[PDB]
Write a protein that binds this ligand. Structure first.
Ligand SMILES: O=c1ccn([C@@H]2O[C@H](COP(=O)(O)OP(=O)(O)O)[C@@H](O)[C@H]2O)c(=O)[nH]1
Ligand SMILES: O=c1ccn([C@@H]2O[C@H](COP(=O)(O)OP(=O)(O)O)[C@@H](O)[C@H]2O)c(=O)[nH]1
Ligand SMILES: [Cl-]
Ligand SMILES: [Cl-]
Ligand SMILES: [Cl-]
Ligand SMILES: [Mn+2]
Ligand SMILES: [Mn+2]
Ligand code: NA
Length: 525
């Protein structure tokens, strides 16, 4: 046998779903699919339903998948592209695309697949037929990419799937987001909707409108058993069935108002206990402390940053410099924030407030991942997972950052790796911009904030701390505009003084630390 042409004929034979046009968002995830992704995108641009946007989230592809999607996204306003800077799984990438999407209806399409040119039209009409309907799905077929023949799944040409789901945007803010596993969470989220809304509000359009490419070592190969060249058996694996039993029980036992909070996004800890095979989340085995200073001139920026990072950490330390009162959204955090209000500009140490909590944590011998942020930077949804995972790459023995400065060894002769600019490979540097750094507290045995004498140059004093402790500063790899600026219309005598007094710099300062450790060996070229 059977072919894709036979499916196309059956669809034209049917009128199901052919009788105000809201924006439809299609969320595409991609991971090393450069051979397939342009076919996936073109099958959406050729959709009958014309009021669409295609949201593409690349999950840190090592091939040129994102280069292709970036090329296409600049040809049209219907395509927008984003890149996670670490491999976190398709469901983390879907949730990132949802937050970027703008449509009232949300569909999905994996990058290794294509679909029928009438899929969104027919499914949208079925969805909106009955105003009490919450979501719609259609059927899919597995295909051999060479021959365009149907691979039968349990001896059927087509069957209902989960990638074919379409739903109103309100689902995600009422019951939360996809669980950030590697596989299975579409089965979970489907049955999460059915619990909350009632399965009768899930309409099924039983037509073969989605065409799944069959490729080896993909995510669903976990469940495959080959019979012949035209049939396979789909049967859950052990690790998949542990998860199915798990969320079924969870669906019964979890108060339905809590789904919204159990499955928030972004996140850094597993929502459900799963083996490491099922999760790519950082899962820090120590607490995560986010430290930020802010001024009232940038309250619109600070509101954004607290919303994104609120679930990306265990605790905040907020230093308000000149606020009239604590904004609503900061004290809403409650105990998650240790706020420090400073109303007199004369009693202010300014950006040195990023390191107030560092003294207390060392004095109490409490460990954690210490992150410092500014209030003019837009942090992506994968920020804290990426930083902890890069820190773990060097076994927590180093400090990582994004705004890196490298000096001559004997401005204008500094090389500046700006945080919003790209960097292809990790590169050791001399100074990291403290709006973007991260490190483990147990690198440091002693610390006193009194050492940070003058304000306005916290970046420099922190390098001197790292140098005097034999600690290396790593500028990690990143796509362009992973972080971005939101200055929005918002010498150096002491600067040059502190540098020369504490020489040497350049690669002479870095090479002693790269010297005999093989994980650092490629940081210095
Ligand atoms: O770490 C990963 C693994 C997979 N995928 C994407 O998830 C989608 C579905 O994965 P796969 O094709 O492996 O699923 P299957 O075809 O086995 O059902 C594809 O677009 C992959 O690029 C992803 O974004 N990140
Ligand atoms: O009086 C001030 C001015 C600035 N900052 C903080 O200093 C950091 C960086 O400020 P800015 O973006 O001006 O620094 P630059 O990027 O120019 O180094 C942010 O946390 C600001 O809220 C502060 O606490 N008090
Ligand atoms: Cl990006
Ligand atoms: Cl899956
Ligand atoms: Cl948390
Ligand atoms: Mn696939
Ligand atoms: Mn700044
Ligand atoms: Na675009």
């Amino acid at each position: 046998t059977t072919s894709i042409t036979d499916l196309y004929n059956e669809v034209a034979k049917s009128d199901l779903g052919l009788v105000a046009n809201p924006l439809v968002s299609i969320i595409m995830t991609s991971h090393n699919t450069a051979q397939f992704i342009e076919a996936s995108i073109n099958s959406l641009l050729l959709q009958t339903y014309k009021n669409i946007e295609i949201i593409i989230v690349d999950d840190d592809s090592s091939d040129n998948t994102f280069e292709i999607a970036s090329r296409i996204a600049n040809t049209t306003s219907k395509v927008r592209v984003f890149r996670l800077n670490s491999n976190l799984g398709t469901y983390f990438a879907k949730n990132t695309g949802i937050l970027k999407s703008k449509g009232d209806i949300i569909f999905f399409q994996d990058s290794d697949d294509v679909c029928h040119h009438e899929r969104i039209e027919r499914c949208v009409n079925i969805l909106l037929a009955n105003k009490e309907t919450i979501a719609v799905r259609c059927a899919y077929s597995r295909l051999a990419p060479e021959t365009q023949h149907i691979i039968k799944v349990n001896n059927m040409d087509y069957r209902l799937g989960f990638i074919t789901l379409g739903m109103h945007r309100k689902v995600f803010q009422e019951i939360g987001f996809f669980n950030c596993t590697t596989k299975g969470s579409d089965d979970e989220f489907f049955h999460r909707i059915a619990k909350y809304y009632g399965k009768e509000k899930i309409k099924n359009l039983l037509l073969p409108l989605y065409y799944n490419t069959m490729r080896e070592n993909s995510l669903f190969t976990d469940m495959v058993e080959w019979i012949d060249n035209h049939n396979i058996i789909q049967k859950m694996s052990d690790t998949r069935q542990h998860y199915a039993t798990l969320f079924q029980a969870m669906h019964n036992e979890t108060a339905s108002h809590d789904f919204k909070n159990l499955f928030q996004f972004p996140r850094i800890y597993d929502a459900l206990p799963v083996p490491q095979e099922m999760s790519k989340l950082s899962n820090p085995k120590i607490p995560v402390y986010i430290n930020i200073c802010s001024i009232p001139s940038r309250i619109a920026q600070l509101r954004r940053i607290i919303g994104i990072l609120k679930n990306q950490c265990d605790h905040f330390h907020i230093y308000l410099d000149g606020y009239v009162e604590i904004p609503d959204f900061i004290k809403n955090l409650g105990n998650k924030a240790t706020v420090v209000h400073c109303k007199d500009k004369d009693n202010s140490i300014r950006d040195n407030g990023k390191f107030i909590l560092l003294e207390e944590l060392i004095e109490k011998n409490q460990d954690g991942y210490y992150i410092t942020c500014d209030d003019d930077i837009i942090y992506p949804s994968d920020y804290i997972n990426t930083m902890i995972k890069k820190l773990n790459e060097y076994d927590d023995k180093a400090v990582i950052g994004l705004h890196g400065i490298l000096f001559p060894s004997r401005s204008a002769d500094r090389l500046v790796y700006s945080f919003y600019k790209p960097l292809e490979k990790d590169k050791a540097v001399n100074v990291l911009g403290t709006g973007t750094v991260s490190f483990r507290v147990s690198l440091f045995n002693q610390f006193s904030l009194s050492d940070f004498t003058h304000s306005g140059m916290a970046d420099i004093y922190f390098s001197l701390l790292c140098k005097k402790n034999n600690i290396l500063q790593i500028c990690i790899s990143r796509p362009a505009n992973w972080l971005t600026e939101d200055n929005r219309d918002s010498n150096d005598e002491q600067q040059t003084q502190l540098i020369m007094e504490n020489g040497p710099w350049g690669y002479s300062s870095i090479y002693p630390l790269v010297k005999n450790h093989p994980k650092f060996t490629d940081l210095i070229p």
